[PDB]
Coordinates of N, CA and C in Angstrom, one line a residue:
Chain A
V1 N 5.1 16.9 21.4 CA 3.9 17.0 20.5 C 3.9 18.3 19.8
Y2 N 4.2 19.4 20.5 CA 4.2 20.7 19.9 C 5.3 21.0 18.9
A3 N 6.4 20.2 19.0 CA 7.5 20.3 18.1 C 8.1 18.9 17.9
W4 N 7.6 18.3 16.8 CA 8.0 16.9 16.6 C 9.1 16.8 15.5
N5 N 9.7 15.7 15.3 CA 10.8 15.5 14.4 C 10.3 14.5 13.3
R6 N 10.8 14.7 12.1 CA 10.4 13.9 10.9 C 11.6 13.4 10.2
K7 N 12.0 12.2 10.5 CA 13.2 11.6 9.9 C 12.9 11.1 8.5
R8 N 13.8 11.5 7.6 CA 13.7 11.1 6.2 C 14.4 9.7 6.0
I9 N 13.6 8.6 6.0 CA 14.1 7.3 5.8 C 14.0 6.9 4.4
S10 N 15.1 6.6 3.7 CA 15.1 6.2 2.3 C 16.4 5.4 2.1
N11 N 16.4 4.6 1.0 CA 17.5 3.8 0.6 C 17.9 2.8 1.7
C12 N 17.0 1.9 2.1 CA 17.3 1.0 3.2 C 16.6 -0.3 2.9
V13 N 16.8 -1.3 3.8 CA 16.1 -2.6 3.7 C 15.2 -2.7 4.9
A14 N 13.9 -2.3 4.7 CA 13.0 -2.2 5.8 C 12.5 -3.6 6.2
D15 N 13.1 -4.0 7.3 CA 12.7 -5.3 8.0 C 11.9 -5.0 9.2
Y16 N 10.6 -5.1 9.1 CA 9.7 -4.7 10.2 C 9.6 -5.9 11.2
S17 N 10.5 -6.8 11.2 CA 10.4 -7.9 12.1 C 10.9 -7.5 13.5
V18 N 11.7 -6.5 13.6 CA 12.3 -6.1 14.8 C 11.4 -5.0 15.5
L19 N 10.3 -4.7 14.9 CA 9.4 -3.6 15.4 C 8.4 -4.1 16.4
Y20 N 7.7 -5.1 16.0 CA 6.6 -5.6 16.9 C 7.1 -6.1 18.2
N21 N 8.3 -6.6 18.2 CA 8.9 -7.0 19.5 C 9.4 -5.8 20.3
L22 N 8.4 -5.1 20.9 CA 8.7 -3.9 21.6 C 8.3 -4.0 23.1
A23 N 8.3 -2.9 23.8 CA 8.0 -2.9 25.2 C 6.5 -3.3 25.4
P24 N 6.2 -3.8 26.6 CA 4.8 -4.3 26.9 C 3.8 -3.2 26.6
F25 N 2.5 -3.6 26.4 CA 1.4 -2.7 26.1 C 1.7 -1.9 24.9
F26 N 1.9 -2.6 23.7 CA 2.2 -2.0 22.5 C 1.1 -2.3 21.5
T27 N 0.9 -1.4 20.5 CA -0.2 -1.6 19.5 C 0.4 -1.3 18.1
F28 N 0.2 -2.2 17.2 CA 0.6 -2.0 15.8 C -0.5 -1.7 14.9
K29 N -1.4 -0.8 15.3 CA -2.6 -0.5 14.5 C -2.1 0.2 13.2
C30 N -2.7 -0.2 12.1 CA -2.3 0.4 10.8 C -3.6 0.8 10.1
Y31 N -3.6 2.1 9.6 CA -4.8 2.7 8.9 C -4.5 2.7 7.4
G32 N -4.9 1.6 6.8 CA -4.8 1.4 5.4 C -4.0 0.2 4.9
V33 N -3.0 -0.1 5.7 CA -2.2 -1.3 5.4 C -2.4 -2.3 6.5
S34 N -1.8 -3.5 6.4 CA -1.9 -4.6 7.4 C -0.5 -4.8 7.9
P35 N -0.4 -5.0 9.2 CA 1.0 -5.2 9.8 C 1.6 -6.5 9.4
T36 N 0.8 -7.5 9.0 CA 1.3 -8.8 8.6 C 1.9 -8.9 7.2
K37 N 1.4 -8.0 6.3 CA 1.7 -8.0 4.9 C 2.8 -7.0 4.6
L38 N 3.4 -6.4 5.6 CA 4.5 -5.4 5.3 C 5.9 -6.1 5.2
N39 N 6.0 -7.1 4.3 CA 7.3 -7.7 4.0 C 7.5 -8.0 2.5
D40 N 6.5 -7.7 1.6 CA 6.6 -8.0 0.2 C 6.1 -6.9 -0.6
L41 N 6.2 -5.6 -0.1 CA 5.7 -4.4 -0.8 C 6.8 -3.4 -0.8
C42 N 7.3 -3.0 -2.0 CA 8.3 -2.0 -2.1 C 7.8 -0.6 -1.8
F43 N 8.2 0.0 -0.6 CA 7.8 1.3 -0.3 C 8.7 2.3 -0.9
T44 N 8.1 3.5 -1.3 CA 8.9 4.5 -2.0 C 9.6 5.4 -0.9
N45 N 8.8 6.1 -0.1 CA 9.3 6.9 1.0 C 8.5 6.7 2.3
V46 N 9.3 6.5 3.4 CA 8.7 6.3 4.7 C 9.1 7.5 5.6
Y47 N 8.2 8.1 6.3 CA 8.4 9.2 7.2 C 8.1 8.8 8.6
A48 N 9.0 8.9 9.5 CA 8.8 8.6 10.9 C 8.8 9.8 11.8
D49 N 7.7 9.9 12.7 CA 7.6 11.0 13.6 C 7.7 10.5 15.0
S50 N 8.0 11.4 15.9 CA 8.2 11.0 17.3 C 7.6 12.1 18.3
Chain B
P1 N 4.6 9.6 38.9 CA 5.0 8.2 39.0 C 3.9 7.3 39.6
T2 N 2.9 8.0 40.2 CA 1.8 7.3 40.8 C 0.5 7.5 40.0
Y3 N 0.5 7.9 38.8 CA -0.7 8.1 38.0 C -1.4 6.8 37.6
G4 N -2.6 6.8 37.2 CA -3.3 5.6 36.8 C -2.7 5.1 35.5
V5 N -3.0 3.8 35.3 CA -2.5 3.1 34.1 C -3.0 3.9 32.8
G6 N -4.2 4.3 32.8 CA -4.8 5.0 31.7 C -4.1 6.4 31.4
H7 N -3.5 7.0 32.5 CA -2.8 8.3 32.4 C -1.3 8.2 32.4
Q8 N -0.7 7.0 32.4 CA 0.7 6.8 32.4 C 1.3 7.4 31.1
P9 N 2.6 7.8 31.2 CA 3.2 8.4 30.0 C 3.4 7.4 28.9
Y10 N 3.0 7.7 27.7 CA 3.1 6.9 26.5 C 4.0 7.6 25.5
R11 N 4.5 6.8 24.5 CA 5.3 7.3 23.4 C 4.7 6.7 22.1
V12 N 4.6 7.6 21.1 CA 3.9 7.2 19.8 C 4.8 7.6 18.7
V13 N 5.1 6.6 17.8 CA 5.8 6.8 16.6 C 4.9 6.4 15.4
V14 N 4.7 7.2 14.4 CA 3.9 7.0 13.3 C 4.7 6.9 12.0
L15 N 4.4 6.0 11.1 CA 5.1 5.9 9.9 C 4.2 6.1 8.7
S16 N 4.5 7.1 7.8 CA 3.7 7.5 6.7 C 4.4 7.0 5.4
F17 N 3.8 6.2 4.6 CA 4.4 5.6 3.4 C 3.9 6.4 2.2
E18 N 4.5 6.1 1.1 CA 4.2 6.8 -0.2 C 4.1 5.7 -1.3
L19 N 3.3 4.7 -1.0 CA 3.1 3.5 -1.9 C 2.5 3.9 -3.2
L20 N 3.2 4.5 -4.1 CA 2.7 4.9 -5.4 C 3.8 4.5 -6.5
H21 N 3.6 5.1 -7.7 CA 4.4 4.7 -8.9 C 5.8 5.3 -8.9
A22 N 6.2 6.1 -7.9 CA 7.5 6.6 -7.8 C 8.6 5.5 -7.6
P23 N 9.8 5.7 -8.0 CA 10.8 4.7 -7.7 C 11.0 4.3 -6.2
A24 N 10.8 3.0 -6.0 CA 10.8 2.6 -4.6 C 12.2 2.5 -4.0
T25 N 12.3 2.7 -2.7 CA 13.7 2.8 -2.1 C 13.7 2.0 -0.9
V26 N 12.7 1.9 -0.1 CA 12.8 1.2 1.1 C 12.0 -0.1 1.0
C27 N 12.4 -0.9 -0.1 CA 11.7 -2.2 -0.3 C 12.1 -3.2 0.7
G28 N 11.2 -4.0 1.2 CA 11.6 -5.0 2.2 C 12.5 -6.0 1.7
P29 N 12.7 -7.1 2.6 CA 13.6 -8.0 2.2 C 13.0 -9.2 1.5
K30 N 13.2 -9.5 0.2 CA 12.6 -10.7 -0.3 C 13.2 -11.2 -1.7
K31 N 14.3 -11.8 -1.7 CA 14.8 -12.4 -2.9 C 14.8 -11.7 -4.2
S32 N 15.1 -12.4 -5.2 CA 15.2 -11.7 -6.5 C 15.4 -12.8 -7.6
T33 N 14.3 -13.5 -7.9 CA 14.5 -14.6 -8.8 C 15.0 -14.0 -10.1
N34 N 15.7 -14.8 -10.9 CA 16.2 -14.4 -12.1 C 15.1 -13.9 -13.0
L35 N 15.5 -13.3 -14.1 CA 14.5 -12.9 -15.1 C 14.3 -14.0 -16.1
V36 N 13.2 -13.9 -16.9 CA 12.9 -14.9 -17.9 C 12.3 -14.1 -19.1
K37 N 12.5 -14.6 -20.3 CA 12.0 -14.0 -21.5 C 10.5 -14.3 -21.7
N38 N 10.0 -14.1 -22.9 CA 8.6 -14.3 -23.1 C 8.1 -15.7 -22.7
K39 N 7.2 -15.7 -21.7 CA 6.7 -17.0 -21.2 C 5.5 -16.7 -20.2
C40 N 4.6 -17.6 -20.2 CA 3.4 -17.4 -19.3 C 3.9 -17.7 -17.8
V41 N 4.3 -16.6 -17.1 CA 4.8 -16.7 -15.8 C 4.3 -15.6 -14.9
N42 N 4.5 -15.8 -13.6 CA 4.1 -14.7 -12.6 C 5.3 -13.8 -12.4
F43 N 5.0 -12.5 -12.3 CA 6.0 -11.5 -12.1 C 5.7 -10.7 -10.9
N44 N 6.8 -10.1 -10.3 CA 6.7 -9.3 -9.1 C 7.7 -8.1 -9.3
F45 N 7.3 -7.0 -9.9 CA 8.1 -5.9 -10.2 C 7.8 -4.8 -9.2
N46 N 8.6 -4.8 -8.1 CA 8.5 -3.7 -7.1 C 7.1 -3.6 -6.6
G47 N 6.4 -4.7 -6.3 CA 5.0 -4.7 -5.8 C 4.0 -5.0 -6.8
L48 N 4.2 -4.7 -8.1 CA 3.3 -4.9 -9.2 C 3.3 -6.4 -9.5
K49 N 2.2 -7.1 -9.0 CA 2.0 -8.5 -9.2 C 0.9 -8.8 -10.2
Chain C
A1 N -23.9 10.7 -45.3 CA -24.9 9.9 -46.0 C -25.1 8.6 -45.3
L2 N -24.1 7.8 -45.1 CA -24.1 6.6 -44.3 C -23.9 6.8 -42.9
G3 N -24.7 7.7 -42.2 CA -24.5 8.0 -40.9 C -25.3 7.2 -39.9
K4 N -26.4 6.7 -40.3 CA -27.2 5.8 -39.4 C -26.6 4.4 -39.4
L5 N -25.7 4.0 -40.3 CA -24.9 2.8 -40.2 C -23.6 3.0 -39.4
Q6 N -23.2 4.3 -39.2 CA -22.1 4.6 -38.3 C -22.5 4.9 -36.9
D7 N -23.8 5.3 -36.7 CA -24.3 5.6 -35.3 C -24.4 4.3 -34.5
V8 N -24.8 3.2 -35.2 CA -24.9 1.9 -34.5 C -23.5 1.4 -34.2
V9 N -22.5 1.8 -35.0 CA -21.1 1.4 -34.8 C -20.5 2.2 -33.7
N10 N -20.8 3.5 -33.7 CA -20.2 4.4 -32.7 C -20.8 4.1 -31.3
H11 N -22.1 3.8 -31.3 CA -22.8 3.4 -30.0 C -22.1 2.2 -29.4
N12 N -21.8 1.2 -30.2 CA -21.1 0.0 -29.7 C -19.6 0.3 -29.5
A13 N -19.0 1.2 -30.2 CA -17.6 1.6 -29.9 C -17.5 2.6 -28.8
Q14 N -18.7 3.0 -28.2 CA -18.7 3.8 -27.0 C -19.1 3.1 -25.7
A15 N -20.0 2.1 -25.8 CA -20.3 1.3 -24.7 C -19.2 0.4 -24.3
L16 N -18.4 -0.1 -25.3 CA -17.2 -0.9 -25.0 C -16.1 -0.1 -24.5
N17 N -16.0 1.2 -24.8 CA -15.0 2.1 -24.3 C -15.4 2.7 -22.9
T18 N -16.7 2.9 -22.7 CA -17.2 3.4 -21.4 C -17.2 2.2 -20.3
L19 N -17.0 1.0 -20.8 CA -16.9 -0.1 -19.9 C -15.5 -0.5 -19.5
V20 N -14.5 -0.2 -20.3 CA -13.1 -0.4 -19.9 C -12.5 0.7 -19.1
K21 N -13.3 1.8 -19.0 CA -12.8 3.0 -18.2 C -13.4 2.9 -16.8
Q22 N -14.2 1.9 -16.5 CA -14.7 1.7 -15.2 C -13.9 0.7 -14.4
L23 N -12.9 0.1 -15.0 CA -12.0 -0.8 -14.3 C -10.9 0.0 -13.6
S24 N -10.8 1.3 -13.7 CA -9.8 2.1 -13.1 C -10.5 3.2 -12.1
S25 N -11.7 3.0 -11.7 CA -12.4 3.9 -10.9 C -12.8 3.1 -9.6
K26 N -12.1 3.4 -8.5 CA -12.5 2.7 -7.2 C -13.8 3.2 -6.8
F27 N -14.6 2.3 -6.1 CA -15.9 2.6 -5.6 C -15.9 2.6 -4.1
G28 N -14.8 2.9 -3.4 CA -14.8 3.0 -2.0 C -13.6 2.2 -1.4
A29 N -12.7 1.7 -2.2 CA -11.6 1.0 -1.8 C -10.3 1.8 -1.9
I30 N -9.2 1.3 -1.5 CA -7.9 2.0 -1.5 C -7.4 2.2 -2.9
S31 N -7.7 1.4 -3.8 CA -7.3 1.5 -5.2 C -8.2 0.7 -6.1
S32 N -7.9 0.8 -7.4 CA -8.7 0.1 -8.4 C -8.0 -1.2 -8.9
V33 N -6.8 -1.4 -8.4 CA -6.0 -2.6 -8.9 C -6.2 -3.7 -7.8
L34 N -6.7 -4.8 -8.3 CA -7.0 -5.9 -7.4 C -5.8 -6.6 -6.9
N35 N -4.6 -6.4 -7.5 CA -3.4 -7.0 -7.1 C -2.7 -6.2 -6.0
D36 N -3.3 -5.0 -5.7 CA -2.7 -4.2 -4.6 C -3.6 -4.2 -3.3
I37 N -4.8 -4.6 -3.4 CA -5.6 -4.8 -2.2 C -5.2 -6.0 -1.4
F38 N -4.7 -7.1 -2.0 CA -4.2 -8.3 -1.4 C -2.8 -8.2 -1.0
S39 N -2.0 -7.2 -1.3 CA -0.6 -7.1 -1.0 C -0.3 -6.1 0.1
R40 N -1.4 -5.5 0.6 CA -1.2 -4.5 1.7 C -2.2 -4.8 2.8
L41 N -3.2 -5.6 2.6 CA -4.3 -5.9 3.6 C -4.4 -7.4 3.7
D42 N -4.5 -7.8 5.0 CA -4.7 -9.2 5.3 C -6.0 -9.7 4.9
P43 N -6.2 -11.0 5.1 CA -7.5 -11.4 4.5 C -8.8 -11.3 5.3
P44 N -9.1 -10.2 6.0 CA -10.4 -10.0 6.5 C -10.9 -8.6 6.3
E45 N -10.0 -7.7 5.9 CA -10.4 -6.3 5.5 C -10.4 -6.3 4.0
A46 N -9.7 -7.2 3.4 CA -9.8 -7.3 2.0 C -11.1 -7.7 1.6
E47 N -11.7 -8.7 2.2 CA -13.0 -9.1 1.7 C -14.0 -8.0 1.8
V48 N -13.7 -7.0 2.7 CA -14.6 -5.9 2.8 C -14.4 -4.9 1.7
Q49 N -13.2 -4.7 1.2 CA -12.9 -3.7 0.2 C -12.9 -4.3 -1.2

């Protein structure tokens, strides 16, 4: 948490179908978007932190 | 290894998008109907519906 | 000279222009385009925004 990584994801085919099928006790909470509608919207830049 | 469920180790990954007018790059997967000239039709240009 | 005949025209050319400029001002939603609130939000948070 004190030193996180920020992967620059760009120029890809974002298929979020492989995401929700994760380990037990998972949450797909979205602040602003809906997790169900993330398949017909062209995203410009996506940043992933860990 | 014996902590409570509420205090067990978790891992969090957050995704921050930039859904604005800039050229899109990580557009999801969804066809590409051919184009059509002047006609009363529905369009989907990179999200703009 | 013909200014009171232009004031009634300018007043109508202003209320019609001050009304088309309120279609791009969100009042508490994520954007002012109605085609973007239904493409990012499912149908129960949409009805709220």
